[PDB]
Design an enzyme around this catalytic site. Structure first.
Site, PDB file in Angstrom:
ATOM      1  N   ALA A   1      40.147 112.051 -19.124  1.00  0.00           N
ATOM      2  CA  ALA A   1      38.972 112.636 -19.546  1.00  0.00           C
ATOM      3  C   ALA A   1      37.856 112.148 -18.590  1.00  0.00           C
ATOM      4  O   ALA A   1      38.319 111.062 -18.035  1.00  0.00           O
ATOM      5  CB  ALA A   1      38.774 112.395 -20.983  1.00  0.00           C
TER       6      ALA A   1
ATOM      7  N   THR B   1      36.356 103.491 -16.519  1.00  0.00           N
ATOM      8  CA  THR B   1      35.557 102.850 -15.164  1.00  0.00           C
ATOM      9  C   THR B   1      34.189 103.722 -15.151  1.00  0.00           C
ATOM     10  O   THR B   1      34.313 104.805 -15.552  1.00  0.00           O
ATOM     11  CB  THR B   1      36.446 102.776 -13.926  1.00  0.00           C
ATOM     12  OG1 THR B   1      36.728 104.151 -13.984  1.00  0.00           O
ATOM     13  CG2 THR B   1      37.575 101.936 -13.965  1.00  0.00           C
TER      14      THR B   1
ATOM     15  N   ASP C   1      43.376 109.719 -32.180  1.00  0.00           N
ATOM     16  CA  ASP C   1      44.679 110.005 -31.725  1.00  0.00           C
ATOM     17  C   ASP C   1      45.090 111.421 -31.960  1.00  0.00           C
ATOM     18  O   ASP C   1      44.737 111.847 -33.254  1.00  0.00           O
ATOM     19  CB  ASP C   1      45.728 109.161 -32.305  1.00  0.00           C
ATOM     20  CG  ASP C   1      46.867 109.237 -31.527  1.00  0.00           C
ATOM     21  OD1 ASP C   1      46.929 108.949 -30.062  1.00  0.00           O
ATOM     22  OD2 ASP C   1      47.757 109.562 -31.889  1.00  0.00           O
TER      23      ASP C   1
ATOM     24  N   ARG D   1      44.406  98.970 -12.541  1.00  0.00           N
ATOM     25  CA  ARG D   1      45.734  98.808 -13.162  1.00  0.00           C
ATOM     26  C   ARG D   1      46.203  97.250 -13.377  1.00  0.00           C
ATOM     27  O   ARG D   1      47.097  97.161 -14.409  1.00  0.00           O
ATOM     28  CB  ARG D   1      46.787  99.454 -11.889  1.00  0.00           C
ATOM     29  CG  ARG D   1      48.199  99.278 -12.276  1.00  0.00           C
ATOM     30  CD  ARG D   1      48.951  99.307 -10.953  1.00  0.00           C
ATOM     31  NE  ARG D   1      48.387 100.174 -10.100  1.00  0.00           N
ATOM     32  CZ  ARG D   1      49.035 101.340  -9.585  1.00  0.00           C
ATOM     33  NH1 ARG D   1      50.416 101.526  -9.948  1.00  0.00           N
ATOM     34  NH2 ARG D   1      48.725 102.164  -8.887  1.00  0.00           N
TER      35      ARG D   1
HETATM   36  C1  LIG Z   1      45.542 105.896 -23.552  1.00  0.00           C
HETATM   37  C2  LIG Z   1      44.527 105.544 -22.556  1.00  0.00           C
HETATM   38  O1  LIG Z   1      44.044 104.446 -22.680  1.00  0.00           O
HETATM   39  S1  LIG Z   1      43.674 106.794 -21.900  1.00  0.00           S
HETATM   40  C3  LIG Z   1      42.400 106.492 -20.915  1.00  0.00           C
HETATM   41  C4  LIG Z   1      42.238 107.211 -19.549  1.00  0.00           C
HETATM   42  N1  LIG Z   1      41.045 106.977 -18.942  1.00  0.00           N
HETATM   43  C5  LIG Z   1      40.422 108.068 -18.672  1.00  0.00           C
HETATM   44  O2  LIG Z   1      40.969 109.356 -18.371  1.00  0.00           O
HETATM   45  C6  LIG Z   1      38.982 107.712 -18.289  1.00  0.00           C
HETATM   46  C7  LIG Z   1      38.668 108.035 -16.662  1.00  0.00           C
HETATM   47  N2  LIG Z   1      39.845 107.523 -15.731  1.00  0.00           N
HETATM   48  C8  LIG Z   1      39.200 106.421 -14.979  1.00  0.00           C
HETATM   49  O3  LIG Z   1      38.073 105.870 -15.304  1.00  0.00           O
HETATM   50  C9  LIG Z   1      40.214 105.576 -13.791  1.00  0.00           C
HETATM   51  O4  LIG Z   1      40.480 106.516 -13.109  1.00  0.00           O
HETATM   52  C10 LIG Z   1      41.087 104.765 -14.501  1.00  0.00           C
HETATM   53  C11 LIG Z   1      40.903 103.732 -15.447  1.00  0.00           C
HETATM   54  C12 LIG Z   1      42.086 105.845 -15.104  1.00  0.00           C
HETATM   55  C13 LIG Z   1      42.014 104.113 -13.201  1.00  0.00           C
HETATM   56  O5  LIG Z   1      41.008 103.595 -12.338  1.00  0.00           O
HETATM   57  P1  LIG Z   1      41.437 103.368 -10.934  1.00  0.00           P
HETATM   58  O6  LIG Z   1      40.348 102.553 -10.244  1.00  0.00           O
HETATM   59  O7  LIG Z   1      41.561 104.469 -10.285  1.00  0.00           O
HETATM   60  O8  LIG Z   1      42.928 102.719 -10.471  1.00  0.00           O
HETATM   61  P2  LIG Z   1      43.344 101.688  -9.681  1.00  0.00           P
HETATM   62  O9  LIG Z   1      42.168 100.738  -9.292  1.00  0.00           O
HETATM   63  O10 LIG Z   1      44.696 100.491 -10.379  1.00  0.00           O
HETATM   64  O11 LIG Z   1      43.767 102.310  -8.659  1.00  0.00           O
HETATM   65  C14 LIG Z   1      44.457 103.634  -8.885  1.00  0.00           C
HETATM   66  C15 LIG Z   1      44.684 104.365  -7.579  1.00  0.00           C
HETATM   67  O12 LIG Z   1      43.810 105.038  -6.947  1.00  0.00           O
HETATM   68  C16 LIG Z   1      43.061 104.359  -5.716  1.00  0.00           C
HETATM   69  N3  LIG Z   1      41.851 104.143  -5.729  1.00  0.00           N
HETATM   70  C17 LIG Z   1      40.943 103.306  -6.310  1.00  0.00           C
HETATM   71  N4  LIG Z   1      39.822 103.559  -6.046  1.00  0.00           N
HETATM   72  C18 LIG Z   1      39.596 104.936  -5.659  1.00  0.00           C
HETATM   73  C19 LIG Z   1      38.313 105.860  -5.171  1.00  0.00           C
HETATM   74  N5  LIG Z   1      37.148 105.776  -5.205  1.00  0.00           N
HETATM   75  N6  LIG Z   1      38.969 107.052  -4.676  1.00  0.00           N
HETATM   76  C20 LIG Z   1      40.235 107.179  -4.566  1.00  0.00           C
HETATM   77  N7  LIG Z   1      41.217 106.302  -4.940  1.00  0.00           N
HETATM   78  C21 LIG Z   1      41.123 105.248  -5.391  1.00  0.00           C
HETATM   79  C22 LIG Z   1      44.164 103.012  -5.811  1.00  0.00           C
HETATM   80  O13 LIG Z   1      44.198 102.256  -4.589  1.00  0.00           O
HETATM   81  C23 LIG Z   1      45.276 103.463  -6.594  1.00  0.00           C
HETATM   82  O14 LIG Z   1      46.130 103.939  -5.688  1.00  0.00           O
HETATM   83  P3  LIG Z   1      47.502 103.314  -5.234  1.00  0.00           P
HETATM   84  O15 LIG Z   1      48.310 103.314  -6.481  1.00  0.00           O
HETATM   85  O16 LIG Z   1      47.849 104.221  -4.231  1.00  0.00           O
HETATM   86  O17 LIG Z   1      47.355 101.936  -4.854  1.00  0.00           O
END
Ligand SMILES: CC(=O)SCCNC(=O)CCNC(=O)[C@H](O)C(C)(C)COP(=O)(O)OP(=O)(O)OC[C@H]1O[C@@H](n2cnc3c(N)ncnc32)[C@H](O)[C@@H]1OP(=O)(O)O
Ligand SMILES: CC(=O)SCCNC(=O)CCNC(=O)[C@H](O)C(C)(C)COP(=O)(O)OP(=O)(O)OC[C@H]1O[C@@H](n2cnc3c(N)ncnc32)[C@H](O)[C@@H]1OP(=O)(O)O
EC number: 2.3.1.48
Lengths: 213, 4, 394, 394, 213, 4
Positions: free
Chosen positions: C186, C90, C278, C101
């Site tokens: 990451a 994202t 991987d 999610r």
């Molecule tokens: C095997 C693979 O594919 S590995 C790839 C893993 N990727 C990475 O490490 C890249 C970086 N990570 C990211 O970009 C992202 O955090 C992701 C894709 C891992 C998840 O994105 P998110 O928007 O955080 O997740 P999602 O929208 O489902 O909600 C996640 C949680 O954080 C919360 N959240 C959403 N936006 C925010 C924000 N700005 N600040 C804090 N928390 C937030 C959500 O409510 C949720 O909490 P809950 O479970 O209490 O409801």
């Protein structure tokens, strides 16, 4: 004392080799000029030669808006000219680039533009001067000379958009970092050093039998 | 020379 | 139902979004797992395809996912498919709020539904078969000469094509379905520099593992059969420790381990799957050089993987593995609107690069990614992103 | 006592070792902490020096440490010195076993003993002052011409030097002594590729923090006064959490926080010290670009540091800080055998490179490092590593 | 049909530009030969010129044993010769390097050696042929031709040690990767392309008044 | 071109 002699001589060479390189370079510049003359003559007989080269070259797409390709499809000719030949008042690295566009009905005008690139003092950075060009009618919204205020919120927004088009690259100067077309100097150099000198290598690659190149 |  | 239906059912109501499902041309490739010479059953063919997705909001991209599907054929009716989830990212430039999610889980449901036979229609061979062709082995002179002797002799400069050189297979609509992924947070994976954006939420190691674990849990319950195999493995952790996270899961059959076990050929290299970028592939190729591949048992592999820095000096990572049959029979050839299949690797790369190639340390990049992606589709491909009317209450 | 005494008292009995104490020429540099314009007291001069050590066993290097000492002068008698511990590494090519922990603590004791005035004798100015000199601003032609007109006029090609351009200071033998370090494990710091060696022991984040914390504890008890300030800070952790590790410490005054507090100028940039390759410096220069330096309070700095990946996606790191007076008055100008002070930055770099520049993925590099280091000292510097007879029972 | 003409011509250029570059290159090779002739004459009058250049050049130290400097201090001359001039049977990139050592009493012999480097087919890698040289008497222990068995445990040990000396670099061929002097090709290129062509730049830098350069 |  025979050492003061050796040293004094070595210094002469030192101020010489600078003017020597300028020579080995101008030699190439010259040897190559007529060669491109011939090659260009043939190229001018080939339909769509440059449209094809510029959509085949992989790196070139990166510098410009996807949409610019509608106008880039219209490039009849590209001619690169190394200035150091027309007067020793130019850096062996200086050059001009001439494009010819065959326009489009009711949108983009037909025209031929020459942007000039020359090194400026300070090892020297490459710089340019803005040059007129008739932006497409589609690009009105993002036309810098169609925007009343570049500093306004919706004004800086549209302006920065037009500065990512290849038309915006014709303004690039090299002196307003972060303000003008991005990497305008790298793109220029791509033309002078890769695209122009190897257009034929890319045309031949576009011509692979079987979709998958 | 970033490239995008 | 269609990809378009799936996403809308997880995006907020009344809201409008756009998305891109890009898909590679199914290419016949080498085996997912390194085969041993003296073995009764080795793969007949391995068909690899990539699905890459992006979501857009109000003219900005904000999410992307890259998943490979691997269909392996052993013989007539003995097939097997594996969905490998490579990257998910994202950039924190969504004006509105959404459950990444749920979007991520949904897109995998979709992929799971696809009839394996779909990747089996036309497959690009690893090496193909009257001469006179212009190919990678054709100096530009040769090529120009060729176009010359092909003009002088023929009206134009093209040939004949009926042309069928392009593989084709079949297998049962319901096969063994595997899902494999390696969690490893990451700063960014598909949106360069986006980590410099303040509004971007990064999960940490333990946060990510639970995140993924929940999605697979949902897929296990809703999309697989009650005897499906679900394995979790947390390098550097205690089997008691993992069993504790697993007590969190709603699916009953989660166990510690992986889905590679197999007492047949108890040797790492002949069991470990090799995927793009991987860590498993990484550590294997590490042994190929230092020549130990035929000396590390599967058991040892896991124990050694933990060492040699990488894992030793990085946050929590997990290996998830699934292996069973899906509830519903997967049978869904995606429509022109479910996917966009570029003419070549070259075009595929080029469209992808508009997104994964941008700089996201500012909203500029994410807006640029959007326009360039539609402008291009429209211009060079005569298509356009799909629009979505979200329909999820609260 | 001497450096030679210190090390021997921590290496195993009867055992023979060799070591290298390399030292930069004390250079007058800018302030450790960024000063504010409108401030009553700003530094008069900041003298920076580097101490780099290596231990050798049986013709192999196996350990190295790089520490900067910073002496800041405010005026006549108002001085202050800071010892900053940059890097410490092992390559796991020691045939025998040793406590790196004790070697590291010992070398710091030694450094603590040095009379600050030692770095104050002759100091290389940041910018120095009848022309006719050959300097960085001298094209080779100019230089050759010069040597010409200097031969024709003089017997030879050298000049006059009495030459005193070379600063000199004094301060009280007992000053405020600070020690600062940032724990952050990594596969290697000074021995490239050594992580590929199996016999090399890597501490993880929590293991390293305790490791360092114990050494400072020892130094706090044995080398400082009972009212010395000892601060610990673990980015990403709870003040309750840190207080728990601190209950481990034997020194009574360890508190949570750092030694930068100062209610005077409650603004990050005017408090945070900037060291080589330090994350604190890193995050500060990050704000200089994105222009926020005058907007982040000291308090916020710590809270924000935790975010922006780096810390968010890496193992346990700690900031340790010490600030008090030493038990004994530090007064010890090191002997020609305690240190080796190369003639120039150029020679310093070159000797160092024999070690930090090698490849340690095999015993070859570590042996090469040893020979090249002695051969060179003997050849170009007419010296030789110090030999040690270890004398520590069990 | 006028297209079959254009294309057939472009191909001629394509097979031409290869032989054209060979020319612009040989021009430089020639222009520079006498220039080094002069410059070398002076250099030969300067005491310790090469000893000084080779201890000043920062990168050069990295390739060789610290101890080799005792013998490197003895280099009276280094002459680089580009083979393409003596017969078109050579790559414009090929060259020989001639060293002269003034020896040392009872340890290192006086001698002049020429190692030849030329590109081999396959874009071409740079290769060489071993050439005789009188290893110092100090280096007996690690002398490859003084070791009875290179495969023995104490034999492979001493051999790999001698292969890190600059004497060991005279055996380097480019065909036994991992077995011979490390990066022998990079070092050769350092001589032909940096050290030799810029020896004077480094001598002048060694000559800075005030210890700290 | 490693360099040591
Ligand atoms: C095997 C693979 O594919 S590995 C790839 C893993 N990727 C990475 O490490 C890249 C970086 N990570 C990211 O970009 C992202 O955090 C992701 C894709 C891992 C998840 O994105 P998110 O928007 O955080 O997740 P999602 O929208 O489902 O909600 C996640 C949680 O954080 C919360 N959240 C959403 N936006 C925010 C924000 N700005 N600040 C804090 N928390 C937030 C959500 O409510 C949720 O909490 P809950 O479970 O209490 O409801
Ligand atoms: C602020 C800074 O300076 S940061 C620099 C931190 N450096 C790094 O991250 C670089 C990599 N780390 C290393 O090279 C090293 O592990 C160091 C320097 C951190 C410590 O080295 P060690 O040799 O592990 O430490 P030391 O010899 O004092 O003993 C450490 C512990 O491990 C044990 N140990 C020693 N050798 C080994 C081995 N091969 N395997 C397992 N344990 C070992 C010791 O007994 C001791 O345990 P104890 O407390 O139970 O007695």
């Amino acid at each position: 004392n025979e050492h003061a002699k050796a040293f004094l001589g070595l210094a002469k060479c030192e101020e010489e080799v600078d003017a020597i390189e300028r020579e080995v370079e101008l030699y190439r510049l010259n040897k190559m000029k007529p060669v491109y003359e011939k090659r260009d003559a043939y190229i001018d007989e080939i339909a769509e030669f440059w449209k094809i080269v510029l959509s085949q070259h992989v790196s070139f797409a990166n510098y410009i808006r996807a949409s610019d390709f509608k106008y880039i499809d219209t490039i009849d000719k590209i001619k690169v000219e190394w200035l150091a030949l027309e007067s020793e008042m130019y850096d062996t690295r200086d050059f001009s680039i001439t494009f010819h566009f065959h326009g489009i009905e009711g949108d983009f005008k037909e025209q031929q533009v020459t942007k000039v690139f020359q090194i400026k003092k300070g090892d020297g950075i490459l710089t340019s001067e803005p040059v007129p060009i008739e932006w497409p009618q589609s690009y009105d919204s993002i036309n810098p000379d169609l925007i009343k205020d570049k500093r306004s919120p919706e004004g800086k927004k549209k302006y920065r958009q037009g500065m990512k088009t290849i038309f915006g690259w014709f303004r690039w100067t090299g002196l307003k970092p972060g303000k003008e077309f991005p990497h305008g100097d790298s793109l220029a150099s791509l033309f002078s050093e890769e695209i122009y000198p190897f257009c034929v290598k890319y045309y031949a690659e576009a011509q692979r039998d079987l979709e998958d190149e | 020379t970033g490239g995008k | 139902m269609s990809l378009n239906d799936f996403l809308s059912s997880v995006l907020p109501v009344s809201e409008q979004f756009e998305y891109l499902s890009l898909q590679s041309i199914p290419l016949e490739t080498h085996a997912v797992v390194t085969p041993n010479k003296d073995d009764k059953r080795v793969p007949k063919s391995t068909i690899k395809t990539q699905h890459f997705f992006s979501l857009f909001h109000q003219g900005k991209v904000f999410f992307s996912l890259e998943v490979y599907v691997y269909v392996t054929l052993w013989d007539e009716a003995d097939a097997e498919r594996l969905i490998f989830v490579s990257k998910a990212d994202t950039n924190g430039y969504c004006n509105t709020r959404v459950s990444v999610r749920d979007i991520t889980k949904i897109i995998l449901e979709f992929i799971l539904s696809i009839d394996p036979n779909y990747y089996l229609q036309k497959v690009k061979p690893a090496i193909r078969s009257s001469p006179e062709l212009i190919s990678a082995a054709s100096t530009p002179a040769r090529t120009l000469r060729i176009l010359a002797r092909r003009l002088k002799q023929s009206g134009s400069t093209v040939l004949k094509e009926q042309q069928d050189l392009y593989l084709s297979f079949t297998c049962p609509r319901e096969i063994l379905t595997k899902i494999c992924l390696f969690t490893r947070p990451a700063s960014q994976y598909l949106f360069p520099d986006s980590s410099k954006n303040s509004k971007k939420h990064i999960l940490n190691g333990e946060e990510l593992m639970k995140w993924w674990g929940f999605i697979l849990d949902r897929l296990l319950i809703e999309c697989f059969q009650n005897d499906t195999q679900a394995k979790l493995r947390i390098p550097g952790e205690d089997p008691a420790r993992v069993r504790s996270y697993l007590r969190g899961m709603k699916y009953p059959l989660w166990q510690v381990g992986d889905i590679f076990t197999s007492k047949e050929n108890s040797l790492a290299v002949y069991n470990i799957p090799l995927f793009p970028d991987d860590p498993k592939a990484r550590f294997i190729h590490q042994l190929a050089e230092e020549d130990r591949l035929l000396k590390v048992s599967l058991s040892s592999f896991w124990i050694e993987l933990q060492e040699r820095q990488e894992f030793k000096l990085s946050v929590t990572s997990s290996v998830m593995g699934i292996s069973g049959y899906s509830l519903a029979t997967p049978s869904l050839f995606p429509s022109s609107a479910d996917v966009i299949v570029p003419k070549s690797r070259k075009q595929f790369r080029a469209i992808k690069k508009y997104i994964t190639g941008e700089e996201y340390d500012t909203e500029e990049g994410a807006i640029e990614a959007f326009t360039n992606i539609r402008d291009f589709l429209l211009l060079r491909m005569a298509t356009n992103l799909q629009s979505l009317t979200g329909k999820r209450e609260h």
